[PDB]
């Protein structure tokens, strides 16, 4: 599609990130409020999630199992929600500094950028230990995505690029994505295609798979987008920070 469409959601102050489940729930982390927020696929009546203790909640990620999981960027934390729970659970990470942005793959594991240590980390399902990324020259690294084969994806915010780690691998490959500014947020689809806010330039750029062109999505009016998501039907959806909206592009 050419026309964005904004979401019906209510009283946003500066949202940060963006989760889309299989069910195409939209989850909203509402960075200025403390709180995270959903709306139901064909509802215009937004729900809080009955998170406690946040202090301006940065990216959020769901899994299968409708799990919630928040990285608590202000209390150096990342908390989980079942489905259906009013009790939330504090991870086991340790050492965060300002976390930015999270990603679960299917076997459970979360993957949490460490902005404020230039680091991302890596906890298992069923570990109280994590493990560093070997990733390499890392600056404020604020957004991260994992695909089915392992891959995880980082924007590295000040360094102006995007980088990528095979599964298993100790060398990560910088994507050639052109003239970005503070990229903040990316998403991976099914094909393989990246998505990333490049907030400082106001839009959303794509790179298709094996493609060295990036592509600008068709959005409009937006200002320093920070997060974006993108579903099995390849719609895009990009909290749209600086107008206090989540906008979502059909594909």
Do not use: C, E, I
């Not at 299989?22 to 959903?38: E, H, L, M, Q």
């Not at 009546?45 to 899994?63: E, K, M, R, W």
């Amino acid at each position: 599609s050419n026309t964005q469409t904004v979401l019906p959601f209510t009283g946003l102050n500066t949202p940060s990130g963006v989760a889309v489940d299989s069910a195409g729930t939209v989850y909203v982390t509402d960075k200025g409020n403390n709180r995270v927020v959903k709306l139901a696929a064909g509802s215009n009546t937004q729900t809080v999630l009955p998170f406690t203790g946040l202090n301006t909640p940065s990216g959020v990620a769901v899994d299968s199992a409708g799990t919630v999981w928040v990285t608590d960027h202000g209390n150096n934390r990342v908390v989980k929600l079942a489905a259906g729970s009013n009790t939330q659970t504090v991870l086991p990470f340790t050492g965060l500094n300002t976390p930015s942005g999270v990603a679960v793959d299917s076997a459970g594991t979360v993957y949490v950028t460490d902005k404020g240590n230039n680091r991302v980390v890596k906890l298992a399902a069923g570990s109280n230990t994590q493990t560093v990324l070997p990733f390499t020259g890392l600056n404020t690294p604020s957004g991260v995505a994992v695909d089915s084969a392992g891959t995880v994806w980082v924007t590295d915010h000040g360094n102006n690029r995007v980088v990528k780690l095979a599964a298993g691998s100790n060398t990560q490959t910088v994507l050639p994505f052109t003239g970005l500014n503070t990229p903040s947020g990316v998403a991976v689809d099914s094909a393989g295609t990246v998505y990333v806010t490049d907030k400082g330039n106001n839009r959303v750029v794509k790179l298709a798979a094996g493609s060295n062109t990036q592509t600008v999505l068709p959005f409009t009016g937006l200002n320093t987008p920070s997060g974006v998501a993108v579903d099995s039907a390849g719609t895009v959806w990009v909290t749209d920070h600086g107008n206090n909206r989540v906008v979502k592009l059909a594909a």
